[PDB]
Amino acid sequence: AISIKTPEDIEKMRVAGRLAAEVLEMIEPYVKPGVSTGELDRICNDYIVNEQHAVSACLGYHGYPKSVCISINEVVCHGIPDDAKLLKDGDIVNIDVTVIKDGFHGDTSKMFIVGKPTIMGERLCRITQESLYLALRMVKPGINLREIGAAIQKFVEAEGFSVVREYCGHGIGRGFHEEPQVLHYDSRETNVVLKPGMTFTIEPMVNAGKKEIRTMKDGWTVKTKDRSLSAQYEHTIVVTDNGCEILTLRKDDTIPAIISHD
Ligand SMILES: NNC(=O)c1ccc(-c2ccccc2Cl)o1
Ligand SMILES: [Mn+2]
Ligand SMILES: [Mn+2]
Ligand code: NA
C-alpha cells in the first residue's frame, strides 16, 4: 500500500516542501523571550495565506484548531498556540508546519532555543536532529523502514534519552498522512521496503526522560508523563534511485539536500 509519485508530482512536492521550510525560516526572528505562541501562529498563518498563497493543512485536521503546532519544553507535540502562553529564556520550542500548495503537502518542524540555551536543552535538540539526520542518510531503495527505526532508537537511547512510541513519520502527498507509517523505533510489525518515488516524513520525538506521555484535557496538548523535556525535528523527503532528496531543507540545516549513495 505504497504510492509512487510521478516526476510532475515530485516537483509539486518540492514546491510545497520549500514553502513549509520557508515558514520556519521566516518565523525564526520572532521566536524570542516574551512572545506568545498565539501571535507566532498568527504570523505563520498570515505568511502562508497572504505571502505563499498556500494554506495550513493542520487547521481542521481531525479538528485541530490552529495553523501550526507549537510545543514548549515538556510538551511532546500538538501544543496549541495561545495568546496567554509566553516564551521565556531557556525554553526549547518546536514549531511544526504543514502546508498544502497545488494539492500537495509539505511537512516539517524544528526546535528553536529561546534566549540563553541550557546545556541539556541544547544537547537534547542536537541529538534529536542528529537522529533524524542519521535516518536520512540511510534512506535508499531496498532498505526496510524497520532498519531505519531501529537505528534511530539505538542512537537516541545510547544518549540516555527515549523515543516516543505513539507518533510516527508518514507517507505524504495529496494526503496529509498516507501510508506507510514510519516508526522511529524497532517494531516486529514493521516491514516496508523503500522504492524510488516514495515520499514520506521522518519526525522523531525524543524525551530526555521516560517514553511515556500524557494528553492534556484540551484533547490535544501532549506532555511527557514525567514532565521531562522533549524535542522533535522533521523533514519530508522523496526516495531517489540511489538515496533521497530532502524537500524541506532550510539554510540552517547541516545536511545536504541531495543524499546520494553508491
Ligand atoms: N499540525 N498538526 C498536526 O500535524 C496534527 C494534528 C493532528 C494530527 C494527527 C496525526 C495523526 C493521527 C491523529 C492526529 Cl489528530 O496531526
Ligand atoms: Mn509535522
Ligand atoms: Mn509529519
Ligand atoms: Na517539547
UniProtKB/Swiss-Prot annotation:
This is Methionine aminopeptidase. Changing H78A: Reduces activity 100000-fold for the Co(2+)-complexed enzyme, but only 2.6-fold for the Mn(2+)-complexed enzyme. Disulfide bonds: none annotated. PANTHER family: METHIONINE AMINOPEPTIDASE. Substrate binds at H78, T98, H177. A divalent metal cation 1 binds at D96, D107, E234. It comes from Escherichia coli (strain K12). Its cofactor is Co(2+); Zn(2+); Mn(2+); Fe(2+). CDD domains: MetAP1. Monomer. Its EC number is 3.4.11.18. Keywords: Aminopeptidase, Hydrolase, Metal-binding, Protease. Belongs to the peptidase M24A family. Methionine aminopeptidase type 1 subfamily. One of its GO terms (biological process) is proteolysis. GO terms for molecular function: ferrous iron binding; initiator methionyl aminopeptidase activity; metalloaminopeptidase activity. Binds 2 divalent metal cations per subunit. Has a high-affinity and a low affinity metal-binding site. The true nature of the physiological cofactor is under debate. The enzyme is active with cobalt, zinc, manganese or divalent iron ions. Most likely, methionine aminopeptidases function as mononuclear Fe(2+)-metalloproteases under physiological conditions, and the catalytically relevant metal-binding site has been assigned to the histidine-containing high-affinity site. A divalent metal cation 2 binds at D107, H170, E203, E234. Removes the N-terminal methionine from nascent proteins. The N-terminal methionine is often cleaved when the second residue in the primary sequence is small and uncharged (Met-Ala-, Cys, Gly, Pro, Ser, Thr, or Val). Requires deformylation of the N(alpha)-formylated initiator methionine before it can be hydrolyzed. GO terms for cellular component: cytosol. It is an enzyme of class 3 (hydrolase). It catalyses: Release of N-terminal amino acids, preferentially methionine, from peptides and arylamides.
